[PDB]
Amino acid sequence: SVQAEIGILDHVDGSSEFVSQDTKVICSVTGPIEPKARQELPTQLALEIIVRPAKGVATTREKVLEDKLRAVLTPLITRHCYPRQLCQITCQILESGEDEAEFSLRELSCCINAAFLALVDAGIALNSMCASIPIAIIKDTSDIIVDPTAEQLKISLSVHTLALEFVNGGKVVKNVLLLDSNGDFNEDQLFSLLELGEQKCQELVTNIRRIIQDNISPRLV
Amino acid sequence: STFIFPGDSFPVDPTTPVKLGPGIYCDPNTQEIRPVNTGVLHVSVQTAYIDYSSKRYIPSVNDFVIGVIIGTFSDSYKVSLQNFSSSVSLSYMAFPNASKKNRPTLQVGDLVYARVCTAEKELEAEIECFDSTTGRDAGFGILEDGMIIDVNLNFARQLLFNNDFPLLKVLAAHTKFEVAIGLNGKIWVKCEELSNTLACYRTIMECCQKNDTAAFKDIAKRQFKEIL
Amino acid sequence: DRRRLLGPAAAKPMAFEQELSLHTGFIENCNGSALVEARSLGHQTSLITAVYGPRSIRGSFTSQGTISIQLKNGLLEKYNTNELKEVSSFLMGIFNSVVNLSRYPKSGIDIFVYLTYDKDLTSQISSLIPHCITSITLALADAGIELVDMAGAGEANGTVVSFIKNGEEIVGFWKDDGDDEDLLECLDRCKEQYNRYRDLMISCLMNQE
Amino acid sequence: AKDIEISASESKFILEALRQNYRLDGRSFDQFRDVEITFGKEFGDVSVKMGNTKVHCRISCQIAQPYEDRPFEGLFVISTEISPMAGSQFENGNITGEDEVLCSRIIEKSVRRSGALDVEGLCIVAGSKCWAVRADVHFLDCDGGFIDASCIAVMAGLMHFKKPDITVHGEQIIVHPVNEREPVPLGILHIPICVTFSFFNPQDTEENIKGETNSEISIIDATLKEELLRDGVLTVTLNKNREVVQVSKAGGLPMDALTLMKCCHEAYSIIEKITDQILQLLKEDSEKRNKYAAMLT
Amino acid sequence: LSLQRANVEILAVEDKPSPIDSGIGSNGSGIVAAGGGSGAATFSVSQASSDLGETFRGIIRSQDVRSTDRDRVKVIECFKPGDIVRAQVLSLGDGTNYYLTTARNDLGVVFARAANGAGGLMYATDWQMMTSPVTGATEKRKCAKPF
Amino acid sequence: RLEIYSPEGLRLDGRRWNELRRFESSINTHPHAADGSSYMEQGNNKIITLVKGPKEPRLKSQMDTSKALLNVSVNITKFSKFERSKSSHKNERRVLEIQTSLVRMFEKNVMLNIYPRTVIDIEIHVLEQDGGIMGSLINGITLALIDAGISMFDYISGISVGLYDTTPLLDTNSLEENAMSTVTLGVVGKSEKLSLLLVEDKIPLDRLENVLAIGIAGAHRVRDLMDEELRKHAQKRVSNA
Amino acid sequence: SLSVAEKSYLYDSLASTPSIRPDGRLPHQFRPIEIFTDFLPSSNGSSRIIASDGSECIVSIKSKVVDHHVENELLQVDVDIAGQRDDALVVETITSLLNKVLKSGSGVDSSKLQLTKKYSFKIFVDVLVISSHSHPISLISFAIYSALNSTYLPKLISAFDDLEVEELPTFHDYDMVKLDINPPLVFILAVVGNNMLLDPAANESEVANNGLIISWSNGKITSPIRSVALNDSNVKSFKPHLLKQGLAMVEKYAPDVVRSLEN
Amino acid sequence: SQIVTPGELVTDDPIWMRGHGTYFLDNMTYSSVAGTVSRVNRLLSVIPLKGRYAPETGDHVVGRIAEVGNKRWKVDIGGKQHAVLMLGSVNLPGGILRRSDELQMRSFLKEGDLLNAEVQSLFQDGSASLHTRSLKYGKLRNGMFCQVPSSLIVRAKNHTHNLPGNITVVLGVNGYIWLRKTSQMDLARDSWQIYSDENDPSISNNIRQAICRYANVIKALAFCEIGITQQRIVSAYEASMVYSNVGELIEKNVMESIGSDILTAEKM
RNA sequence: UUUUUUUUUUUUUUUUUUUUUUUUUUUUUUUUUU
């Protein structure tokens, strides 16, 4: 299963921490605040996204992750409620949980989940809820594995990341926010993978709802 | 009454007209009512709103706030309500019995108690140092000396609007003090001796760190015993 | 490098007259462009130039326009930064005399030249200067920037001379190495090349309407 | 905005409380904050907590080539890049600003220049192959005192790290997997620890420069509110052999020399306790790992 | 917008786009401003005029909105952020802004959206009114004359 | 293997344990380039300091309505040592640290609050370098600032002391700085208060007060020399003009 | 910075027959300068030039022993100008020109740098400009000329032929040999209408139509010749007969400048 | 008087009132600059030996336009700050309120222009406010510009003088000097064209030669650190007629000789 | 004993890393108390 914690930093508007197997990410959110003159948008909210790796300095490998995170997060936020304001989102990877020289999908899923939790904790207006899982297809057996380990990634044939959008009590799928597939596959494998991923994402979003309700309710009267 | 999430079904009859409060959005394209915040939905000519946790203040008309003077212009002051936020403006004619000969004498770095009067979406918010709706002047103006405490918004609302919140009563049982409460997340206190003000500051910080209102008295007693 | 993929650190690099064609206006996202391609017996060259502007500029108010010229390598990195910048400065000096800069207050004009192709079919940067001048003139005319005259150049034994007004005036002089007593012959040869280049440029502008 | 605004009332209150021997959080003038150290699953993964300041460190290594000038040593580098996660007053890419440069230089002089790490033990084949060691510091939450927390975290992470065992097979080398041949630790020569002091002037400048009395105030390990109002700062590094590793007082409020010597003498009592605490925590972690490995037999 | 003036950016000079390349797609995915990406912090100031996607800027003062009653003009009852406005140049100004006017019948708002840019397009109905077709709501503008 | 301190009490260049090197300074050396200037010679060190301002700021962003902004720039040439430097020193972290230290030193001494909305620029060129360069930089800045007629509270004097086993040596050179640990000091006026204290190598804890006292006395002598030179120049200037 | 009226007045004065210069100088007359040499003891040679308007330059000469088969160029110049970036266009243009004027075959006698059949001296020229008000090519050239004529090099005392058996070069510990190489000079000229001017001032450069850079060596004009723009608001084209006039002017008046820099 | 240095004790008498250049602690007064002690009744202060020009009300100054702003200009006069010239402080050829001239300020004065002005008042920090509300002030033309240190300008009641050879000199208090051809207004001293950039089309060679000689002798006087006055300027101009070529006056020995001759003639 | 109120100015941040280098060498058997 997964472990998530809410509200752990003192000088930001919202924060969270997501753990899945051996992957660990901490995220923070500050906004809405005043932006720089070159970041300003006349009618909607602007975003500034930073991702930092576990070892070394940031390179072009983190730029792709920032691009995908920005693609996922833009339709989730009700951006027109905060004209010409800024929201800062920073993710720090503490433990990759995989071999960074070859794979980066577990980090992407963990960052997506942590950023959503921090956005909920901060108080930003959101259109709906989200959940993200990694998937792999293993050689020889040709079996589809949800949440693969680091050992199963080393003998895989294709790796996938799926992020979905849920409404109406976490029971209706509204859109596919991101699907990222790399490897070698045919159509039947793809349409089996989507069907399995939908159920796994539904279970994950139910669990996330329970965690959020447990954490937030004591703060209110 | 119930816990709600963004994207959930709104449990209100579409026929009955209901005025919308914070946390509820009307779609400009589909004309649909949906919630956008997480928390508890309260339904009271009836009004519905969602109570959610927050720390970043957004100006709203008829709110009591505490600000800092950060710049003086030809006709108004430049005022900050929170670090890293856009500033607001306070006009030289927004004081009681003000005229072009009776100018105000505030400096950069002063604390002020004011009310939000204009919060247009396309403009910069404005504040005034007197209640223009009623003509009353109840505590608005400069705050001399004292100390400032940062809290979250729900705590400040509980202090200002709930008379069954027991913090002020337990504080009054130890010392005499002055207080001003701002809905932007600021509390100002002052006592005759510095040790009493320090004890009040420590008590308020510790009480805000907690969520149980039944432990306030023990915290206050321990803190006021600490200063000897 | 945090912004580029340069590979492993321990790797080592592997160690082992003229006929012209002129065309303008083929790049979509700029204001003006030109392609110059010259061939002879023992040389072959291709060049592309692009003009951006007039555009906004950072700073205080200026009463006349500003010109910037950038030279870039192509395919093969045959020249280093210092000589490219020296040639850029020489070209900027030339083209500050022909552009009507008083017509463009508080604005800038940026010019880019790409050295795509240069092959020896059978002292090397000096012979490339005339084609750069021709390409920049063609691109500036294509973009609609006001010029008082058409500028050309010629090369002869390490000497480059640029002319206007039918070869009666000089806007640029360059000389490296060469014979010390050979000045009149160089001028005559450069002017002879300049006249042909001017004819070809005017024909290109007039035909391709 | 990126500017932290302080009102006149807050400044006056804090200075007057300092005049009456009061700190906002209830410490005395010479009291250091409590330190919590937690070790991760991997070797070289350490978390350090000092009240409200949180810092994370990670150690890693890989094969490289030695320098031509020095063919008998390995490579060591320390990276400390700050982000808006620790606070919205910090820029994302800023390695040229005053405070960042000062912190980087102080950490470099305390750890790498003092020779706390044995870089001659990182050589594999003299002149051709060696180890390159990295230390990455992550700043999570700022309540003052990044320098001390960073020094503690780097030293603890270096003392917790282990590198794989290798053997030389003719011309090339073989790096054994961890589940085969029991990775080995690094050699540490001494353990340096930094302490920071803050100075406040309860008078005007004329009294400080031409006055006879010395009424300046010194406190240890200031918080974020305190260090935004200070007039000077001093950092001193020491080890248990009574050696001054480095001293840095780069301008600020002029201070009498006897007070500075008193500060240097007060830092030693703190560093002794910190060193003992680190050693005890490392011993307990090693015993826990050995007991679990025995129980998993 | 403010109480004294409006700030605009120039998109076309006499039915010709300015600049030719707007920089779309240079900052990746999402909705980003021209100077809101990674390349804005590494632009060579001393080797060029301006960065990719930069435009000319202008200012409309409240006294220049119209030719009559130019002391009781309310800016937010004339323009909104995100509107397309046709104006005329008055002066070169300083190095940052031009000075513009709309005090003529053919100058003003030509395109606008309801709900401050979150809704659909509106159409001009009167000299000072626009109407939303989907829901018959009206807003106040300074409409440029069509046809 | 050399005799740093001989049994007869002599150093390698012939000095004794408490003697300064030759100290020569000049004032008003570049009248056409700056408001204040100085030329400093301390042993074999050669430094040129120029002070420009107070003046209008270049940009409207670097303007303060309550006080002036102070900037320091240090340039170390490639030919300042026996061996030519391979690359430039302009953007090294060491140079930035030196500049920040100097700015923070002189912020507290100059009365910046009586020149609001102005900027003061200090440019320094180091031509030759033979040990103890930080103290020479401090002395040159002090002389150039006083030559420009800018208000300040007192003098600041720089000095360096090396510790050789148990023997303190005053005003060390390059040979001594490569064989022992050194301490750099900045002293205010004729008091015991320190503006700068810089120790970069290991020193025993129970041997620092003696070094501090020796350095303080040396800095007092340096201040005396600077004051004498300034008074002599002023007397010559006012005698005829 | 000048106004329109000032520029018109100055241009009318300069472009007249005969020309009138603002300080009354003749068309070929130079301004006074001060020269100091041998003031950096750690260098092989040094100089400092101070102009009458405050311009100042400092030059240092240093040497190194290299293998002259791998090394192709034995003279290298590095230029630093205060207030300018290291990659500024004018800095790199001046660096390129100064390296071209001191190349292997240019009139510079590089045979005097040879020690042993395998090795040679490589000369490093470092230039620092403290203050300047116009194009400082000729000031730097004069400073380099002064510094190179007072340079001393170590004396070799360990063999000369080492093609077969090679020994490490070894030098005498006290004696040095004066370098007698032949350095060139670089002049800058201004074109104002139909007149040619030598050594132009800052205000004369703001109204000039164009400019020329001409090199000189041991009695003859040398290869590096360029046309240069001294301003950006008045640059125009010139007739070919002004080039010949400038070359003749430099040929006529260069020998007098040589005698002024002697000793 | 008495020379003092920063940090030096001036007096310990608790009877003096402290002025510029000093700071105090209780009854002890100190010096913050290098200079001389000055006493006026009970006021005690120190006058610095060196410093920039400090504007005073009523001063006659020469400056250059630096910035074109919002209904104002910025003028460089060589002080610590730029001066301010409001649009209402100048004379407009047509009028002020015609049913423009606020967006068209560059048609009158633009960046780089030289002008003649008077100091009207000082702001709180010492910056100056200028006005040009007389026919004797405005745009400068028909001549040449030169600069000397402001401490060498002797204080006087008049600052515009007519010199032999049809030359007029404007001696700025801040040290900025203008030499020009004498006009009708200058002779009489003893509408739309006041903002024109055109020079007189009839300036002869003799006037140019005279202006060159006057600039050379002014620079010679500044080299010897002699205060500049009208009488000294005329005397130095007349004594330099020995040299037929104006270009020989730029050598150091000639300048020193001219200065020494002036001083010797005055002292006799 | 009428009559006498004087108070000046300003708007939204300069662009590319950590390496930052001088005075000269050796030789064949455990453990404790001596």
From Swiss-Prot, chain B:
Compartment(s): Cytoplasm; Nucleus, Nucleolus
Where does the protein principally reside?
cytoplasm
Q: Name one GO cellular component term.
A: nuclear exosome (RNase complex)
* Keyword Cytoplasm attributed: yes
Q: Name one GO biological process term.
A: nuclear polyadenylation-dependent rRNA catabolic process
Q: Which residues form the S1 motif domain?
A: 60-130
- Enumerate the UniProt keywords alphabetically: Cytoplasm, Exosome, Nucleus, RNA-binding, rRNA processing
| Lineage: superkingdom | Eukaryota
Q: Name one GO molecular function term.
A: manganese ion binding
Q: Which family does it belong to?
A: Belongs to the RRP40 family.
Subunit details: Component of the RNA exosome complex. Specifically part of the catalytically inactive RNA exosome core complex (Exo-9) which may associate with the catalytic subunits RRP6 and DIS3 in cytoplasmic- and nuclear-specific RNA exosome complex forms. Exo-9 is formed by a hexameric base ring of RNase PH domain-containing subunits and a cap ring consisting of CSL4, RRP4 and RRP40.
Tell me what else is known: Present with 6050 molecules/cell in log phase SD medium.
Primary role? Non-catalytic component of the RNA exosome complex which has 3'->5' exoribonuclease activity and participates in a multitude of cellular RNA processing and degradation events. In the nucleus, the RNA exosome complex is involved in proper maturation of stable RNA species such as rRNA, snRNA and snoRNA, in the elimination of RNA processing by-products and non-coding 'pervasive' transcripts, such as antisense RNA species and cryptic unstable transcripts (CUTs), and of mRNAs with processing defects, thereby limiting or excluding their export to the cytoplasm.
Originating gene:
RRP40
UniProtKB/Swiss-Prot annotation, chain D:
Physiological role: Non-catalytic component of the RNA exosome complex which has 3'->5' exoribonuclease activity and participates in a multitude of cellular RNA processing and degradation events. In the nucleus, the RNA exosome complex is involved in proper maturation of stable RNA species such as rRNA, snRNA and snoRNA, in the elimination of RNA processing by-products and non-coding 'pervasive' transcripts, such as antisense RNA species and cryptic unstable transcripts (CUTs), and of mRNAs with processing defects, thereby limiting or excluding their export to the cytoplasm.
Listed GO biological process terms: exonucleolytic trimming to generate mature 3'-end of 5.8S rRNA from tricistronic rRNA transcript (SSU-rRNA, 5.8S rRNA, LSU-rRNA); nuclear mRNA surveillance; nuclear polyadenylation-dependent rRNA catabolic process; RNA catabolic process; RNA processing; rRNA catabolic process; TRAMP-dependent tRNA surveillance pathway; U1 snRNA 3'-end processing
Q: Which Gene3D superfamilies match?
A: GHMP Kinase, N-terminal domain
> One Pfam family from the UniProt entry?
RNase_PH
Keyword terms: Cytoplasm, Exosome, Nucleus, RNA-binding, rRNA processing
Miscellaneous information on this protein? Present with 4800 molecules/cell in log phase SD medium.
Q: What is this protein called?
A: Exosome complex component RRP45
Q: State the gene name recorded for this protein.
A: RRP45
On the tree of life, the source organism's domain of life is Eukaryota
UniProtKB/Swiss-Prot annotation, chain E:
Anything else the record notes?
Answer: Present with 5550 molecules/cell in log phase SD medium.
UniProt record similarity statement: Belongs to the CSL4 family.
Which subcellular locations apply to this protein?
Cytoplasm; Nucleus, Nucleolus
Q: Which cysteines are joined by disulfide bonds?
A: none
**Assembly notes:** Component of the RNA exosome complex. Specifically part of the catalytically inactive RNA exosome core complex (Exo-9) which may associate with the catalytic subunits RRP6 and DIS3 in cytoplasmic- and nuclear-specific RNA exosome complex forms. Exo-9 is formed by a hexameric base ring of RNase PH domain-containing subunits and a cap ring consisting of CSL4, RRP4 and RRP40.
- Which superkingdom? Eukaryota
GO terms for MF: RNA binding
Please explain the role this protein plays, according to its UniProt record. Answer: Non-catalytic component of the RNA exosome complex which has 3'->5' exoribonuclease activity and participates in a multitude of cellular RNA processing and degradation events. In the nucleus, the RNA exosome complex is involved in proper maturation of stable RNA species such as rRNA, snRNA and snoRNA, in the elimination of RNA processing by-products and non-coding 'pervasive' transcripts, such as antisense RNA species and cryptic unstable transcripts (CUTs), and of mRNAs with processing defects, thereby limiting or excluding their export to the cytoplasm.
Which segments does the entry list as coiled coil?
none
Give the range the annotation lists for the signal sequence. none
Membrane-crossing residues? none
Keywords attached to this Swiss-Prot or TrEMBL record, sorted alphabetically, are: Cytoplasm, Exosome, Nucleus, Phosphoprotein, RNA-binding, rRNA processing
Q: What protein name applies here?
A: Exosome complex component CSL4
UniProtKB/Swiss-Prot annotation, chain F:
Lineage, uppermost ranks: Eukaryota, Fungi, Dikarya, Ascomycota, Saccharomycotina
Record-given protein name: Exosome complex component SKI6
Report the main location listed first in the record.
cytoplasm
Localization, per the record, is: Cytoplasm; Nucleus, Nucleolus
Protein's job = Non-catalytic component of the RNA exosome complex which has 3'->5' exoribonuclease activity and participates in a multitude of cellular RNA processing and degradation events. In the nucleus, the RNA exosome complex is involved in proper maturation of stable RNA species such as rRNA, snRNA and snoRNA, in the elimination of RNA processing by-products and non-coding 'pervasive' transcripts, such as antisense RNA species and cryptic unstable transcripts (CUTs), and of mRNAs with processing defects, thereby limiting or excluding their export to the cytoplasm.
Question: Biological process (GO) annotations?
Answer: exonucleolytic trimming to generate mature 3'-end of 5.8S rRNA from tricistronic rRNA transcript (SSU-rRNA, 5.8S rRNA, LSU-rRNA); nuclear mRNA surveillance; nuclear polyadenylation-dependent CUT catabolic process; nuclear-transcribed mRNA catabolic process; nuclear-transcribed mRNA catabolic process, 3'-5' exonucleolytic nonsense-mediated decay; poly(A)-dependent snoRNA 3'-end processing; RNA catabolic process; RNA processing
- Give yes or no: UniProt keyword Nucleus: yes
Q: Which UniProt keywords apply?
A: Cytoplasm, Exosome, Nucleus, RNA-binding, rRNA processing
Q: Which organism is it from?
A: Saccharomyces cerevisiae (strain ATCC 204508 / S288c)
